[PDB]
Amino acid sequence: VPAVNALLLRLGLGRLDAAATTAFGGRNDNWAGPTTTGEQVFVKTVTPLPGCPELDRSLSFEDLAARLTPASPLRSPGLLGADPAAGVMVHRLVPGARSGAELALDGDFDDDLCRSAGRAVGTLHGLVDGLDTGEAPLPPLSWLKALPWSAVQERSMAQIAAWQLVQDDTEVVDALHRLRDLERTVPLAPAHCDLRFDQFIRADEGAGELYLVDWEEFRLADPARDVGAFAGEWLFHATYSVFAGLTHEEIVARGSASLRRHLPRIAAFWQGYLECRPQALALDAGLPERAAAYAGWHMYDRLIATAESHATLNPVARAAAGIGRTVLLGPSAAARTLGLSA
Amino acid sequence: ASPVARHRGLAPRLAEALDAVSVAPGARRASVAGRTVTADSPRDLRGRLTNALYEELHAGRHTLRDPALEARLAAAVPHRTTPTRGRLVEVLRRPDGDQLVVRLPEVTARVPADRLLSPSVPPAPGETVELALEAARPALSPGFFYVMGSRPLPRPAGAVRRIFLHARDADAAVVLWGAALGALEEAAALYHAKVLSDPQDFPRRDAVVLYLHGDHRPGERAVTEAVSRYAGTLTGPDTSVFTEELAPGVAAAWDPQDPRPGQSGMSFGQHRAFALASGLIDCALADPGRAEHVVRALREAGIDPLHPQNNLD
Ligand SMILES: Nc1ncnc2c1ncn2[C@@H]1O[C@H](COP(=O)(O)OP(=O)(O)O)[C@@H](O)[C@H]1O
Ligand SMILES: [Mg+2]
Ligand SMILES: [Mg+2]
Ligand code: NA
């Protein structure tokens, strides 16, 4: 609280109006609401290094984004200030923000929103000096060989069981190693690297404009990370989120039918992505394949996160992991099926 | 005109309960103690009725954890270390501190080498090692603070005697927690245990759960002696119909032992309720020979219908 107020004071924002403040989500402590000067702010705090590589990457995005026209499908809320030493950032609040996760649950992330998202990400990938060129720790390759003991003491029995299934699947582990190895063999681009539906916000209770937020992992990196993540989110929505005992074959049949009904969403995103990055496949013909491989890992990623509140892995979880494995070990076919071709 | 009279072959506690339960002909409607339940299939009534039975008969009904409660539960634990065996995959050598990659039974993990306890020196990859791992595990069981006992559990694991304590609220839980852990250690028991770490979900009959392995009698006697003091003040007096009462709010059973491939990862309470729901449904799908349907379903699930807290040999 002190470090936040100190920054609000110095920016001319007064203080956080405790009567109208409210905590928002994510692995960081965040505050949103009116300040005593009446301005609406979003405040994020990140635990410094014993400064803060996640805010330096987030700011590196804000620097690129300030030099952008107001017609860009890619928009920042607007950075108001930052204290990277103390782990504090402040942005303009988007009024009546609905996250992409809420929209997808409600049924509102439609084909046309998916296209705008593709345009935003395609725009991102076009835009590179002063970008972190370090590799994103996803997939987590050291964890696939051995979870650090401190990580095991903070996980659920189901997350541990899910880790173990991945660790003992030699084909999956080898594929994830190949996937990260390929990143130094492709034309890199400015990439979010942590893209999910909850990193998107839309203004006016869902009727406003589209923002992509949480740039803590922003890097010069494989564009397939962001395309794959977007496809993987739909994959995971379709084969898990909507289902949350049948037979395994019935779970698979329902999941397959559910995915097919959601494939247009991925198609729209890729349409939009090509509108704004028309030269993508000309530079990287392997991009569809690599994207599909990231979509596969993304399901494991989302299944392991979801398990934090469970003690066993349910049969839907296991069925979804099976689809994740199929997309990862067969990336050329999953790309075509997902609609990421030509 | 006795519940035992109309329900022969069934433990009386269970026979009494089935008088609060009816399933309509065709198994599209059921009623558990005024808690009516409906479905469009027999097959979907199985899952809903299972749930109603579980709530009414096992649990007794009808988000986050708490760092204060956790801190007090953590303090109550009498030990801090549980030796754990696994196979050494690889010694990692760092100047900042050497590390062991160890395949534990549940996961491959990267452990500081200062935890090795046997052999006295990191062996060749493939050799069993033994490590001093934290006894407390506050994230392992969502909703709960979990502790492993100081003494390692048997290798075949074996049958696990469960003991449930009906803590009335968080304060009783701390006391019952401490008494039970103190008791189980002193008795040299092979166990895990856990207690609700969410103060807004008491009372529960399973607010504390103890999992006793090897020979449970010493640890059960010890725990019963240690908590009977509090039993009815700190514990609500009601227990699950599927369990053997040992005292007001102190109940016991065995982990399900269903020799049917599909049945696994089911709690005692969910398993008993599912067997009961099945038998009740199979009954409704004909046309008391009702108790026979129930008795058949329990036996097929491996439950002793005379003592459903137990399994068949
Ligand atoms: N400027 C903003 N206006 C409105 N809501 C926002 C804004 N920035 C973030 N949020 C919301 O708060 C959530 C947390 O923000 P995010 O940057 O993802 O934090 P974390 O790093 O902890 O995930 C976002 O997912 C979004 O839903
Ligand atoms: Mg986020
Ligand atoms: Mg973030
Ligand atoms: Na949907």
Residue B167 belongs to a domain: yes
Do residues B52 and B73 both lie within one domain? no
Least Cα distance to B110 among B119, B120, B121, B98 occurs for B98
Residues from chain A that touch B137, judged by Cβ atoms under 8 A, are 153
Of the ligands numbered here, which is closest to the C-alpha atom of A213?
1
Q: What is the stated resolution of the deposited model, in angstroms?
A: 2.3
Do residues B156 and B26 both lie within one domain? no
Do residues B231 and B176 both lie within one domain? yes
Rounded to whole angstroms, the Cα distance separating B117 from B132 reads: 7
Element (H, E) at A287: helix A287-306
Do residues B175 and B33 both lie within one domain? no
Do residues B200 and B233 both lie within one domain? yes
Do residues B215 and B71 both lie within one domain? yes
Count of the separate structural domains present in chain B: 3
Q: Which residues 6+ apart lie within 8 Å of A253 measured at CB?
A: none
Do residues B74 and B87 both lie within one domain? no
Q: Residues, chain B, total?
A: 313
CA A195 to ligand 3 center in whole angstroms? 9
Q: For A167, name the nearest residue in chain B, comparing CA atoms only.
A: B108
Residue B31 belongs to a domain: yes
Rounded to whole angstroms, the Cα distance separating B142 from A9 reads: 40
Amino acid of residue B288: P
DSSP B170: H
In chain B, where does DSSP find H-type helix? 3-6, 12-17, 42-53, 67-76, 170-186, 217-228, 268-284, 289-300
Q: In angstroms, what CA-CA distances link A200 with A196, A217, B267?
A: 7, 15, 39
Do residues B169 and B229 both lie within one domain? yes
Rounded to whole angstroms, the Cα distance separating A193 from B162 reads: 46
Do residues B220 and B231 both lie within one domain? yes
Rounded to whole angstroms, the Cα distance separating B132 from B81 reads: 6
Q: Which of B89, B113, B134 is the last residue of a domain?
A: B134
Domains of chain A: 2-92 (3.30.200.20), 98-338 (3.90.1200)
Q: Do A160 and B107 touch (CB under 8 A)?
A: yes
Do residues B119 and B156 both lie within one domain? no
Least Cα distance to B193 among B236, B135, B235 occurs for B135
Q: Which residues 6+ apart lie within 8 Å of B175 measured at CB?
A: B230, B234
Residue B162 belongs to a domain: yes
Q: Do A149 and B111 touch (CB under 8 A)?
A: yes
Rounded to whole angstroms, the Cα distance separating A18 from A32 reads: 10
As beta bridge partners, residue B32 has: B21, B35
How far is B230 from chain A, CA to nearest CA, in Å?
30
Residue B251 belongs to a domain: no
Going across the sheet that includes A88-92, the strands are A22-24, A29-34, A40-45, A88-92, A79-83
At residue B288's C-alpha, the angle toward residues B282 and B291, to 5°, is 55
- From start to end of B108-235, where are the E strands? 108-112, 116-118, 128-134, 136-137, 144-148, 161-165, 190-196, 208-213
List the single best residue of A143, A145, A147, A149 to mutate versus B (max B Cβ within 10 A): A149
Residue B246 belongs to a domain: no
Residue B12 belongs to a domain: yes
Residue B128 belongs to a domain: yes
Of the ligands numbered here, which is closest to the C-alpha atom of A41?
1
Do residues B45 and B71 both lie within one domain? no
Domain of B230 in residue numbering reads as: 67-78+137-237
In A127-279, where does DSSP find H-type helix? 141-145, 149-152, 157-167, 170-181, 224-239, 248-276
Q: For B101, name the nearest residue in chain A, comparing CA atoms only.
A: A146
The residues of B whose Cβ lies within 8 A of any Cβ of A are 47, 89, 101-102, 106-112, 115, 133-134, 137-142, 265
Q: Which of B134, B154, B179 is the last residue of a domain?
A: B134
Q: Do A148 and B133 touch (CB under 8 A)?
A: no
Residue B247 belongs to a domain: no
Rounded to whole angstroms, the Cα distance separating B161 from B216 reads: 7
Method: X-ray
Tokens of residue A212, six digits: 């992509």
CA A264 to ligand 1 center in whole angstroms? 27
Q: Which of B92, B115, B134 is the last residue of a domain?
A: B134
Closest ligand 1 atom, residue A24 Cα? 12
Three-class DSSP category at B35: strand
Report the CATH number at residue B90.
Answer: 2.40.50
At residue B298's C-alpha, the angle toward residues B296 and B300, to 5°, is 65
Q: In angstroms, what CA-CA distances link B178 with A22, B68, B74, B89, B183?
A: 37, 16, 10, 37, 8
Do residues B206 and B72 both lie within one domain? yes
Whose Cα sits closest to atom 22 in ligand 1? Answer: A26
In B187-216, where does DSSP find H-type helix? none
Find how far residue B6's CA is from the centre of its chain. Answer: 31
* Inter-residue contact B101 to B87 (CB < 8 Å): no
Residues from chain A that touch B109, judged by Cβ atoms under 8 A, are 146-149, 152
Q: For B131, name the nearest residue in chain A, comparing CA atoms only.
A: A149
